[PDB]
Amino acid sequence: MMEKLKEIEKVTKAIKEKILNHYGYIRVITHHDTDGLSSGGILAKMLMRTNKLFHLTVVEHLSKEVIEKLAKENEVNKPLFIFADMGSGQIEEIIKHNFNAIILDHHPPVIKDSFINENIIQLNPHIFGVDGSREITASGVCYLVAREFGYYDLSVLAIVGIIGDMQYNPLLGLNKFIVNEAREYRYVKIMNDIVYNIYDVEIYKAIAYCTKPYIPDLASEGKAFKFLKDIGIDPNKKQLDDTDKKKLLSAIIFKYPKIENLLIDRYLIEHKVRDAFLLSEMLNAVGRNGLFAVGIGICLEDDECIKIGNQILWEYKKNLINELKSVKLKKLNNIYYFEGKKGMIGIIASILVDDKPVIGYHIEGDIAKFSARGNRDLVNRGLNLSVAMAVAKEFGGNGGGHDVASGAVVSKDKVQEFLKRVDEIIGEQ
Amino acid sequence: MMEKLKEIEKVTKAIKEKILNHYGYIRVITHHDTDGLSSGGILAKMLMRTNKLFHLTVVEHLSKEVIEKLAKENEVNKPLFIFADMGSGQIEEIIKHNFNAIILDHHPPVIKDSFINENIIQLNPHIFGVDGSREITASGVCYLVAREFGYYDLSVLAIVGIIGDMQYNPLLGLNKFIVNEAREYRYVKIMNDIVYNIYDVEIYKAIAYCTKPYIPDLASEGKAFKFLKDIGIDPNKKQLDDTDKKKLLSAIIFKYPKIENLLIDRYLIEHKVRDAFLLSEMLNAVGRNGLFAVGIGICLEDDECIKIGNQILWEYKKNLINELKSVKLKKLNNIYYFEGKKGMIGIIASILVDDKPVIGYHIEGDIAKFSARGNRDLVNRGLNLSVAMAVAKEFGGNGGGHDVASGAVVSKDKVQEFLKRVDEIIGEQLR
Known part of the structure; x- marks a missing residue:
């Protein structure tokens, strides 16, 4: 698997040079999901550290009309564009309008060449036989570019995107390399624990609004509170010790033996939001509320953006439970x-x-x-x-x-x- | 003072609503010196917190040329322009091109109106009779906007601008208001102290590369080391205590008699670069090397940008000392x-x-x-x-x-x- 990296590092070096030698405007385009906002945070820190001012925009889909705008921006001052989690499928429209562009994308590629032409560089794992559905996310692609500058600290946002793209269990390929690099550089510590302990709120709320796993019978404050009381756990405590975890585990598995993923490998990252799984849910909730710039600020560890993220996260999680009860499949x-x-x-x-x-x-x-x-x-x-x-x-x-x-x-x-x-x-x- | 803030509030309340109700692109244009970089950091944090993406550009002079650039960006997708530390002197060209604009400037105004027409707000202390050269800086003016959002934590960057723009001694007017508010909210601590203590390096180096004040007889590590050894101070320590300061001031007066220049009110700020004087010098060095984005990253508390900044500062200070020693006075x-x-x-x-x-x-x-x-x-x-x-x-x-x-x-x-x-x-x- 080390042999894969060496083929990749030839593109990430060409990308590094392309960024270093560009002295005009820089446009970064990403999606609003956890993995896209995480990508933007990685690129934001990477570009600032290399002395690049830039203009980030968040789009929900790189439609042809979005591409036709953005194309008008080329008419004078043609920016260097950096696409994250997008571009590979729209590559013909990007060639057609002749953007100067870097494509950082893990979606299935239409053109399977790294160096499209003089103007375009495409970093796509699928081009190298790495499965962009299981072995790396857009955040991880961005991180491979960042590590050519030695920005190993940005690996924690790659981890957040791993979690947000549902590639954390099992942890394979490049994702697992990134996680191990983060651990060796002391930016992440790994700790098996019960999923409800990541939220640092009263456990009955952590159970009531949990959706991994989602348990309809406990999905309310009253029913989780009584469930915990009936088995001798203080529902108001914010963390479950080992005795409580074992009682909770076996009681849930007894009445719901189908259930899975109650124990997870928690990632404690070097970030003001130390729990990577919490941070992933925060970015998601913030993106889904249209709070793109707040999400970028959370990645940048701004206290006030993080305060907004915490409040948006729990409104979202409550809205989501109400919606799951009301859904007509x-x-x-x-x-x-x-x-x-x-x-x-x-x-x-x-x-x-x-x-x-x-x-x-x-x-x-x-x-x-x-x-x-x-x-x-x-x-x-x-x-x-x-x-x-x-x-x-x-x-x-x-x-x-x-x-x-x-x-x-x-x-x-x-x-x-x-x-x-x-x-x-x-x-x- | 509360009364003058009440009149300023009418303009900053209008600015807050203008930013909040804008959903297009936002361009921030700021200067490259310490006060300009601090303002961009204040505006960067404020915009992100209010859910605005933006595009920051740092210019040395808002010339008629750059104004005619930028105006080309207007013709498709007309952005909201926020000008910091500039704009008041050039308001006629900004009116000419019909920018949608917010001007946050302490320089003397050409047009002394806060509300210019339907599309332009100009916040300038001179309109309120406040002397923009002595009582507030560009980063102060940006902070006046940010406090409409309750972002008192950004006062620390306004203090940096106060230092950067040489408005800290004496501490007058709105600058005084800003510092006391920062102190009230526990974002800054104030401490009379000797200037060499701000750098948190070996004191013989801090003395050797000091330019406030520059003392030619001590402007080398050798001479500074020797001087400290002679008066019984460990040259490699990083803070002079009260006993050290008495001895150093007693001896240094014969080399530099205006010893009062050696004493300052230090500002310890809630920022990774905790000494505000140091952060100001760092921003200055970074700005003088064209490292504008790095400067913003430093305001944003990025660890690698701070690392670059510390390295660029000591390179800049060492080269400044060499430039001085080359002067033929x-x-x-x-x-x-x-x-x-x-x-x-x-x-x-x-x-x-x-x-x-x-x-x-x-x-x-x-x-x-x-x-x-x-x-x-x-x-x-x-x-x-x-x-x-x-x-x-x-x-x-x-x-x-x-x-x-x-x-x-x-x-x-x-x-x-x-x-x-x-x-x-x-x-x-x-x-």
Whole structure:
């Protein structure tokens, strides 16, 4: 696996030189999810340390119209663009408008070349046989560029993105290399513990609003409080010691023997928000609320942005529980689907996935926007939701993403769009 | 003071609402000196906390050229411009191009209105009768906006700007208000102390590279080490205690009699660079090396930027000492003078002033350009540098400025003729 790095480090060195020798404006474009906001934080610290002022914007999707704006910015002062978690699928539109660009993306690539042309460098793990759905995230790609400057301290934000892209269990490939590098440089410590201990709130609240795992029967303050009381745990304590953890573990496993992932490898990172899993949920909640600049500030360890993050996190977690209780899951051939709120579609889908893919959507203006999630086991059986969702180009829209998670657009042909997607997932399976 | 803040509040409340209700791009444009970098750090934190992304640019001069640049960015996606430490002197070009703009500036205004039309707010202390050269800096003006959001923690960067812009002694007006508020909220502690204690390095190095004040006989590690060994102070320690300070001041007066210049009110701030005087010198060195983004990172408390900053500072200070030791200080009757390189005439002349005014020049085209410096005591005794340099519209050109700091331009052939005149008038001014 060391041989993979050496092929990668030839691109990350070319990227380093491209940044060092650029003295004009710099545009950084990222997504608003945990992994995208984490990417932006890594790039922000990296660019400031190399004396680069820059302009970051956060877009929910790198649509063609987003690309046509941004293209007008080239007319005078053509920036160096840095795309994170995007660009690889839109590479033809980027070549067409002739951006000077660095693409830092773990989505399946359309052109499988690192050095597109004179103007473009594409760092994509898939180009090197590393699986961007399981072995590195966009944050991790950004970190590989940062470590050429020796910014090993930025590995903690790579860890946050590992957690936010659901690549932390199991920990494979480059992700596991990054985690080990962080531990060796003393920026992270690893500690097995019960998931509820990461929140540092009263345990009945930590249980009530937990969604990994989500347990409907305990998903309320009253029912968690009584559950803890009935087994001899102070529900008002903020951390569970070893006696309490063992009582809680076996009581939950007795009445819910299906349950999984109650014990996790917690990552305590060198960051004002020391628990990486907490920080991941904070960035997510803040992104889903449109608080892009706050999220970047959290990455930069600003106290007030972190205060806002904590308050947004718990409003979100309460909203999410209310929404999970109210969701009407509908059944087709071999996908489930539902309708929900904008900043909630993707997480509810990944919460509820079990035997078959789940595809949520919310209605915004004149179009519907979809998030589907599979499993690793479903992808092992041949799923691939990026092929499946891109059939939006049959209903006048567009789509793509990862094999295990993808989104789509257009428009008011939803159920017309759904009965197609369920058909491809038949043949793929 | 509460009353003047009440009138200022009407402008800062308007600015807060203008930022909050803007959702397009935001451009921040600021200066490269300590006060300008501190302002960008204040604005950077304030914008992020209010959920605004922004694009920061650092300029040395808001010329008509750069204004016509930037205006090209207007034609597609018209951003909100926030100008810091500049803008008031150039308000006509900003009105011309119809920028959507917020001006946060302590320089003297061209148009003395806070509300200019529908699209431009200008917050300038002179509009409220506050002297922007003595009572508030650009970072103070930015802090006045940030406190509408309750961001009192940003007072620490305003203190840095107060230091950077030489407004800390005396501590007047709104600067005094800002420091007391910082202290009330426990963001700064104040401590009378000797200047060498701000650097937290071996005292023999802190003495060797000090330029406030510069003491030529101690301006080398060898001489400083020896001097400290002689008076019984461990030269490698990093803080002088009270016993050390008594001994060092007792002995140093024979080398530098104006020992009061060695004592300052230190500001210990809630920032990773805890000494505000040190943070100001660091920002200054970083700015002078073009490392503007690093400067913002330092305000943002990034560990690597701080590491670069500490390294650039000591490189800058060591090179400054070498520049001084290269100066060929020639004496007339009442003034010293010297020729030097164009980048640092004023800086070198201000450091060299001890007992007499110092005037430096560098010969450019066929021009000879001068910078003259005095001190508070010299001014109190009669020194008027603007009157003395003005005698250059008598050798073919121009000259003037402030009583303690002025400049002049004079045909390169009449350099000795101009110096004799200036030395004579200053001698008259001082008897």
